Design a protein around this nucleic acid. Structure first.
Length: 178
RNA sequence: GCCCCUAACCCGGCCAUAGGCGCCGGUGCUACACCCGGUCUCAUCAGAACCCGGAAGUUAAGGCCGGCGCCGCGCUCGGGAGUACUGGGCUCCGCGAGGGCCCGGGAAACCGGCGUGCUGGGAGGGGGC
């Protein structure tokens, strides 16, 4: 069960749905060492290099200034995305709320503690963290919106719907959607 | 070479009649695409993008063309209207602020009507020299 054949296929070859990407986010308050622990935890958990996310706006109630890094997120595609997606679904319990699916092929779920993931051991030097995991599904032709030259809008029939995303998650990933 | 005719492609001009929303179609040899990969040039958290190498698949989408409705927009169109306003003259009216007459110019909102890109150069294709 790999990425290239994790596709949901309709009666047209060009309307195949697939996992465009999986993004894992840890949002921590400010800490230098706390953020380094979060970044290392994301690196070990996903196998990919995390990217530090700087605060967009200074909010003094949270004690964060604009430009300082308070997030650690990693974008996973193809094989690493599928492997971590299976691990994270096992951690959550193979269950996703139907109301968690937005109307455009995006589904995000939270992992409260990362020890629930398979293959992870409690460490006192790292503590216990949570994550947001967001899966973005797509059809072929999405590059028309993202390319540099002649960028245009993708037509409505070629965009992933909420019903198609829920059907993909049930029939292809074998997750229980309620 | 050179002349003529001509889709989608490339470089433009004016920059909505060109935009927005929704619905119905056409187009696929070639061209434009979606597309397939990441050895190399190059690139990032991420070959998503950019960059490179391709050609299995598809016109589903983009692009281009045709039709309809709405919003917006445009017009040297009819009305509004010779109206509002106004250049010059006056021993002309009014207590007065002001208004009037003559000569010369003359809108706008809005209503209805119509329209909904036009066009320059090149490639490619066809017909002659």
């Amino acid at each position: 069960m790999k990425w290239k054949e994790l596709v949901l296929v309709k009666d047209h070859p060009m309307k195949r749905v697939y996992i465009e990407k999986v993004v894992v986010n840890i949002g921590v308050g400010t800490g230098g060492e706390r953020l380094e622990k979060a970044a290392n935890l994301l690196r070990e958990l996903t196998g990919a290099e995390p990217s530090l996310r700087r605060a967009k706006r200074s909010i003094k109630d949270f004690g964060i200034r604009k430009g300082e890094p308070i997030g650690v997120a990693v974008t996973l595609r193809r094989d690493k995305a599928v492997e971590f997606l299976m691990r994270a679904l096992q951690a959550v319990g193979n269950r996703i709320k139907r109301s968690s699916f937005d109307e455009r092929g995006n589904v995000c779920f939270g992992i409260k503690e990362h020890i629930m993931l398979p293959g992870v051991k409690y460490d006192p030097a790292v503590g216990i963290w949570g994550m947001d995991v967001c899966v973005r599904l797509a059809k072929p032709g999405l590059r028309v919106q993202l390319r540099r030259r002649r960028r245009s809008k993708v037509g409505k029939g070629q965009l992933v719907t909420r019903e198609e995303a829920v059907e993909f998650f049930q029939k292809v990933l074998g997750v229980q959607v309620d």
